[PDB]
Amino acid sequence: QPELYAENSWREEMTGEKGILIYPRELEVVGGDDDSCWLWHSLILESQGQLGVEVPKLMGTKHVEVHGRWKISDLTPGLKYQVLYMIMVEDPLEGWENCPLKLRVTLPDGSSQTQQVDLCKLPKGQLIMTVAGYFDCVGDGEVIFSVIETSDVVKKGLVIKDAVIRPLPPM
C-alpha cells in the first residue's frame, strides 16, 4: 500500500487549537534498547489490524523512566493544556505494590507538578487515560512530561501506548 506521512496532531474544528500525540518510539525510554528492561511490541486491534504503533512493555527492571518534551511555543497560546499518558497493565504484573507510577510535568521555569497512579488497582488490559498535569500555553521553551518509578524493586507489566498534549477548548 502507498505510504502517507502525516504530523501526529489534530486541530479542533470550530476553534482551531492544536493537540499533539507522541508515540513511544519518539519518547526517551531509559533502558529502551535493553530487552530485559523494555520489549517492543506491535499494537493490534483485532477488528482493524495493526494500529501502526510500536509500544514498549516493561519486562523486569527497577528503573522506570520515560520522558517526552514539546515546545510550548508550538501550541495554541492562552489555552490551558492537559498532558496525558495512555498506558496499560498486563499479566504478569510485579513490583508496583505501594510504588505508584509517578507522572510529572516540568515547565521552563523549573517548576514541576507530580501525580501518582496506583497500577495495582487498574483493570488489566484496559487502555487507561492518566493525567500527568496541566499548563497554560504561554512563553516558550519546552514542557517535559515523564513517567517515573525508581524504587528498589523489580517491576514488570507496564505498557506505554502514547502521550497526548491536548487543549481544553470552549464549545
Binding site: 502517507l4 496532531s9 500525540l21 482493524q48 501502526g52 484496559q126 487507561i128 492518566t130 464549545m171
Partner: protein, 167 residues
C-alpha cells in the same frame, strides 16, 4: 516480526472510570471504498503504519459508523468526532459542503453542513459530529455525506471517536 499487544477500542479515565471509545477505518461503513477508484487505502505513518483510506475522486462520498451506548458511561457528557484530513491537491470542496448527522437512541438527530475549504491543508481535524449525554443502552449512528455533482478529491479518514468532554 515483533510480539503483539492486543487492545480494545475503548479507554477509561484512571481518575474516575469514565469511558470513551473510538473506531478505526476498517470498522466504518464507507460506500465504494473497495471499488478501486473512489478510495485508495494508504499506510498512514506517524513519525509502522495504519490502514487509512484516501479519497481520490468521486461524486459519491458516504461515510457511516455506529457505536453502542452500553459501552459508555451513563450520565456523562460526550463529544462525537471524526478525525480526518484535507490533503494538498484537494478538489471539489468549494461548492459542496459535507452533510453531517449524529443520530441518538432517543430519536433526535443533529445536522450540520461542513465547508471543507476552511479546514487546514495536510493536518488532521477533529470534525465535530455532535454532542450528547450517554444513557444505558441504544445505538449511536453518524453519517458524513455528499453525493452532489462535484468530483471530490483529497480527504483521509483516520478514526471516529466518542470522548468525554476534555477536562
Amino acid at each position: 516480526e515483533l510480539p503483539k499487544v492486543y487492545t480494545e477500542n475503548t479507554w477509561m479515565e484512571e481518575r474516575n472510570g469514565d469511558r470513551g471509545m473510538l473506531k478505526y477505518p476498517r470498522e466504518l461503513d464507507i460506500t465504494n471504498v473497495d471499488d478501486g477508484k473512489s478510495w485508495v487505502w494508504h499506510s498512514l505513518v506517524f513519525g509502522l503504519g495504519m490502514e487509512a483510506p484516501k479519497l481520490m475522486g468521486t461524486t459519491h462520498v458516504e461515510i457511516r459508523g455506529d457505536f453502542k451506548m452500553s459501552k459508555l458511561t451513563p450520565g456523562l457528557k460526550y463529544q462525537a468526532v471524526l478525525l480526518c484530513m484535507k490533503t494538498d491537491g484537494n478538489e471539489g470542496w468549494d461548492s459542496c459542503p459535507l452533510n453531517v448527522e449524529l443520530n441518538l437512541p432517543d430519536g433526535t438527530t443533529q445536522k450540520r453542513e461542513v465547508d471543507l475549504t476552511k479546514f487546514p491543508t495536510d493536518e488532521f481535524v477533529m470534525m465535530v459530529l455532535g454532542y450528547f449525554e450517554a444513557v444505558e443502552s441504544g445505538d449511536i449512528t453518524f453519517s458524513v455525506v455528499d453525493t452532489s455533482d462535484c468530483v471530490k478529491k483529497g480527504f483521509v479518514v483516520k478514526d471516529a471517536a466518542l470522548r468525554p468532554l476534555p477536562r
